[PDB]
Amino acid sequence: DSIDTPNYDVQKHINKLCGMLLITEDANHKFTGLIGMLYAMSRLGREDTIKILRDAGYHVKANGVDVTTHRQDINGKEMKFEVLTLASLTTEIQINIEIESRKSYKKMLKEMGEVAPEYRHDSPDCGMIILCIAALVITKLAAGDRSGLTAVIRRANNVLKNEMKRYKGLLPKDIANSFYEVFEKHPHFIDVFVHFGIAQSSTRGGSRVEGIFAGLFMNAYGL
Numbered sequence: 001d002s003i004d005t006p007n008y009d010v011q012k013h014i015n016k017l018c019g020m021l022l023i024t025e026d027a028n029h030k031f032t033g034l035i036g037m038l039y040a041m042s043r044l045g046r047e048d049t050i051k052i053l054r055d056a057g058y059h060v061k062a063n064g065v066d067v068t069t070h071r072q073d074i075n076g077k078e079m080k081f082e083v084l085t086l087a088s089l090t091t092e093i094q095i096n097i098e099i100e101s102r103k104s105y106k107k108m109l110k111e112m113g114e115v116a117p118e119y120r121h122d123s124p125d126c127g128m129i130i131l132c133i134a135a136l137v138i139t140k141l142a143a144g145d146r147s148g149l150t151a152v153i154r155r156a157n158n159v160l161k162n163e164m165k166r167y168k169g170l171l172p173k174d175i176a177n178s179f180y181e182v183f184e185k186h187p188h189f190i191d192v193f194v195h196f197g198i199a200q201s202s203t204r205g206g207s208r209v210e211g212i213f214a215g216l217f218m219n220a221y222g223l
């Protein structure tokens with residue numbers, strides 16, 4: 001009955017996984033709530049994550065998260081994939097996210113030639129774009145609402161219009177549903193998210209998305 005506790009070392013990998021979903025046309029966001037939450041934990045670090053859970057009364061069986069190279073056959077030819085050792089997310093699911101993302105990337109090349117940095121799966125702000133949706137869901141959880149989904153989509157289409165222009169897979173309805181699902185199924189993620197947001201919103205300036213997140217997070221307490 002383990003909880004994966006990713007450390008700072010797999011932060012870049014989790015951001016890239018977020019970015020792979022963000023470039024996927026009609027992406028399956030079933031795992032985005034979990035992946036976003038894994039990104040938040042990698043930003044907090046393993047030590048602070050275990051501290052948060054233990055202090056909150058949750059008894060945690062910590063699973064170490066490392067990057068492994070998994071060799072698997074796709075269309076007759078053997079391919080190498082970098083995956084995370086996660087008890088909550090199978091090797092198969094991770095590899096299929098990379099496969100679907102690579103199909104959307106080839107379609108992009110065919111449409112516009114080589115892709116600008118801000119349109120790629122490895123843009124440094126992908127994890128934070130996902131956590132912006134989490135910040136909107138947390139507000140609706142706070143306000144007492146349950147059928148707050150309609151307002152999440154509507155607020156998201158306004159606040160994240162530049163990012164939605166950059167990413168075909170930024171689908172607020174599906175992503176909000178995935179976070180609602182993870183916060184109700186795993187309430188310990190609410191404590192992790194709140195500690196992440198308090199710590200993030202301390203870091204002054206930086207990136208446009210980091211600023212959008214800090215603003216969205218600050219709102220959950222009256223703004």
Ligand SMILES: O=C(O)c1cc(C(=O)O)n(Cc2ccc(Cl)cc2Cl)n1
Nearest residue numbers: 016020023098101102103105106121
């Ligand atoms: O020249 C590049 O940087 C490059 C090449 C490719 C590709 O061939 O899919 N891609 C996309 C890509 C690479 C790696 C992974 Cl893990 C996922 C995706 Cl979508 N980027």
